[PDB]
């Protein structure tokens, strides 16, 4: 209800993508 929210979620989208754009990286085959 607009109080604590804000970026808390923004972090999620930055967290769920993190790995995706971190360890998920693999330009060397596989």
Curated annotation (Swiss-Prot):
Domain of life according to the entry: Eukaryota
Effect of gene knockout: Mice are born at the expected Mendelian rate and appear grossly normal and healthy. Females are fertile, but males are almost completely sterile, in spite of normal mating behavior. Two independent studies conclude that male sterility is due to impaired acrosome reaction, but describe contradictory effects on spermatogenesis, possibly due to the use of different mouse strains. Spermatogenesis is normal, with normal sperm counts, normal sperm motility, and no malformation of the sperm head or tail.
UniProt subcellular location: Cell membrane
Signal peptide segment: 1-25
Tissue: Detected in testis. Detected within seminiferous tubules, on round and elongated spermatids (at protein level). Not detected in brain (at protein level). Detected in testis, and at low levels in heart. Expression in brain is very low and barely detectable.
Record note on modification: N-glycosylated. N-glycosylated at two distinct sites. O-glycosylated.
Family: Belongs to the prion family.
Additional note from the record: Loss of cerebellar Purkinje cells and ataxia has been observed in mice with mutations that cause Prnd overexpression in the brain, suggesting that aberrant overexpression of Prnd causes neurotoxicity.
Known function: Required for normal acrosome reaction and for normal male fertility. Can bind Cu(2+).
Domain-related comment: A short helical region is required and sufficient for Cu(2+) binding.
Name recorded for this polypeptide: Prion-like protein doppel
């Amino acid at each position: 209800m607009k109080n604590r929210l804000g970026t808390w979620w923004v972090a999620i989208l930055c967290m769920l993508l993190a790995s995706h754009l971190s360890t998920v990286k693999a330009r060397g085959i596989k």
